[PDB]
Amino acid sequence: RKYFVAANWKCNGTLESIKSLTNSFNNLDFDPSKLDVVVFPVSVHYDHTRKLLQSKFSTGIQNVSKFGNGSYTGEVSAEIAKDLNIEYVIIGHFERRKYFHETDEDVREKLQASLKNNLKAVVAFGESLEQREQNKTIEVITKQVKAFVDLIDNFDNVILVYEPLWAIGTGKTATPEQAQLVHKEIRKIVKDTCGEKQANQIRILYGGSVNTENCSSLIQQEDIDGFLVGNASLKESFVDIIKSAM
Template sequence: MARTFFVGGNFKMNGTLESTKSIVEKLNSAPLASDAEVVISPSFPYLAAAKSIITAKNISVAAQNSADRPNGAFTGEVSVAQIKDVGADWVIIGHSERRTIIKESDELIADKTKYALDNGLKVILCIGETFEEKQANKTLEVCERQLSAVISKISDWTNVVVAYEPVWAIGTGLAATPEDAQNIHADLRKFLSEKLGKSVADSLRIIYGGSVNGANATSFKDKADVDGFLVGGASLKPEFIDIVNSRQ
């Protein structure tokens, strides 16, 4: 089944208003692959500004996190309604930094995913193992546990993209080989097929994240189960355009 190539750019806690606008303007003027879906995720203060100057039809905006409830006395949280109000269509949920640093549980991430979907946002759902878990050969066990928490909460996966991001490869310069990524993605798709049905699993995009850059992105080109990338640091650089165009 043909799945639209997806490239997410997670700016994390980086950038200024000026630099965010500059990145968007460069994307607007770049010859981006027309068959790629591009979703950029600036820091919360710059979401509206980024959205307001996007002119390319295949670029959308994502928040980096959202709450699992509509509003209230929750200092520092941002609601789905607020994210939609500034024009974002997507949210990243369950990124490893939220899991490992902020200590968000599988259950909370599942609740956030359900709430976002139920209230009109599309979700980039992140999963992945730590270095210690990889060394203990627990990669699939961890990823299946993280997915199972979400499977128990939602039934419609139409607006979900799953991002496999091995924690040991994020920001380290290390990356899974294209062959390793393909094997893990294929195993994840098999697991999802068993849990959700083959048609859902075949249509669900599973993207890879972890030190993806302009130099290595093309090496994933022929991997049937790698449907794109979630890019960190390289999304702040001109090479992000090369990643978007890596399937051409």
């Protein structure tokens, strides 16, 4: 399968810093038919970022509404995104589950709205420290994946992201070997629910802490197809993370 490297800039950026960062990103010569590279800027930065990045880079937004057009102050619908040709959306990032009480049902309905409007979706899930220490990793992941997995109508257009919440801000670290085993089981869930060929087609990204040093050890695992990168994607050195997928 085609490797997939994505930059989640989160709530960061200025007009000036994006101008500088996109310029350095543009200096990297890669073939977009050999790997997908997606940048997810803040909503109000999307136009600025899209124009500054060369066409080899894909772009998207960090969240999409579960509702359609109408009386939903502050929301961005999938149909609005389609009209702007916004190619990708992130759904279910743990930060939205944590601070904004986004549920599994919210994730299901957001994916449905996105696919209905021909958007490509990056869907995130993962277990907490308490859940892992109670030996509930498989139980939690299965429930989270089964919340939306049956809706996938194209296995190039939906991309999965494992987020090891147990290793984020806890002092614990997730090893590539531990990541590989989870990814293996995620692909198994997709097999049992969607089919074998579909499971082998779908990309599953690692969504924990990724940097220039650990990136290659992660992507070289058989069932890890790329990353959704946080802090490291705000730096010029992000090009070296992309190089691990080249």
